[PDB]
Curated annotation (Swiss-Prot):
Name of the encoding gene: apr
Protein name: Subtilisin BPN'
Thermal dependence: Optimum temperature is 48 degrees Celsius.
Localization, UniProt: Secreted
Biotech uses: Used as a detergent protease. Sold under the name Alcalase by Novozymes.
Keywords: Calcium, Hydrolase, Metal-binding, Protease, Secreted, Serine protease, Signal, Sporulation, Zymogen
Binding note for cofactor: Binds 2 calcium ions per subunit.
Cofactor or coenzyme needed: Ca(2+)
Whole sequence portion shown: 108 to 382 of 382
Known partners and oligomeric status: Monomer.
Organism expressing this protein natively: Bacillus amyloliquefaciens
Upper classification of the organism: Bacteria, Bacillati, Bacillota, Bacilli, Bacillales
Function: Subtilisin is an extracellular alkaline serine protease, it catalyzes the hydrolysis of proteins and peptide amides. Has a high substrate specificity to fibrin.
Domain Peptidase S8 as annotated: residue spans: 5-274
Length: 275
């Protein structure tokens, strides 16, 4: 039978699905460790690999990318889980290796690929402590080209009074996503700062794993695809909305939680955001 992960329900995605809004024709790039295209609960439309030693974007030797992708778009059928936007056209942009790391050049190459390939939504469940002029340029260009760019805020917790949001999430053009649990409490690991935008479920998230498996993972990497998936639902209902509109809508209709330094604008509500 199919199971609906708590997180999907929490952001109110099923309300949209019931209406017939499921992300059809929206192109979402998962920039990560690849996607196992052999998984019966996923449908990969395309993609590219920028990892010099791992040239097939459709082999995920890590598991991270497959898991993120399932959150965005696990198919609505009689098996496994259900994604936020089950009808989305999913692209595997492999910029991380088997070990879950990757060079900035690889990551940037992936963003440039996504712009050139007309992705509607980019999901970056990754980050580093330092930025670069090239990293900023690429995210800025994507936004200027009308792409919705979403990224995990980071898993650095709190540190005195400073921001622990990593890059590229830290850049204003990118939506920075922090993690909450099923009770709406901020996860202890969730990065904090004035650059945090919104929260989404990120603790014990059940999704797809390579080799026709399913398992839970925790992290802001798990939170981000709920927002990428949400953007895809909005776009399926309002195809003419610009990325700016999508973003404002998501931020403006959240369920307010605690202070913005810890929760940003609050928990997204795709139902409210979709008007
Ligand atoms: Ca399924």
């Amino acid at each position: 039978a199919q199971s609906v992960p708590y997180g999907v329900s929490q952001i109110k995605a099923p309300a949209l699905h019931s209406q017939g809004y499921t992300g059809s024709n929206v192109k979402v790039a998962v920039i990560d460790s690849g996607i196992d295209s052999s998984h019966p609960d996923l449908k990969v439309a395309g993609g590219a690999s920028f990892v010099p030693s791992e040239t097939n974007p459709f082999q995920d030797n890590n598991s991270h990318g497959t898991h993120v992708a399932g959150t965005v778009a696990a198919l609505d059928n009689s098996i496994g889980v259900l994604g936020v936007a089950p009808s989305a056209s999913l692209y595997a942009v492999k910029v991380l290796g088997a070990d879950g790391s990757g060079q900035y050049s690889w990551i940037i190459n992936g963003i440039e690929w996504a712009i050139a390939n007309n992705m509607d939504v980019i999901n970056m469940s990754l980050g580093g402590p330092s930025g670069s002029a090239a990293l900023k340029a690429a995210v800025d260009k994507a936004v200027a080209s009308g792409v919705v760019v979403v990224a995990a805020a980071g898993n650095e917790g709190t540190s005195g009074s400073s921001s622990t949001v990593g890059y590229p999430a830290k850049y204003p053009s990118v939506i920075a996503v922090g993690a909450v649990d099923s009770s709406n409490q901020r996860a202890s690991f969730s990065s904090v700062g004035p650059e945090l935008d919104v929260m989404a479920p990120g603790v014990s998230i059940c999704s797809t794993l390579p080799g026709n498996k399913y398992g839970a993972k925790s992290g802001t990497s798990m939170a981000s695809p709920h927002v990428a998936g949400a953007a895809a639902l909005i776009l399926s209902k309002h195809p003419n909305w610009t990325n700016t509109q999508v973003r404002s809508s998501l931020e403006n209709t959240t369920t307010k939680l605690g202070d913005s330094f810890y929760y940003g604008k609050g928990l997204i509500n795709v139902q409210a955001a979709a008007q």
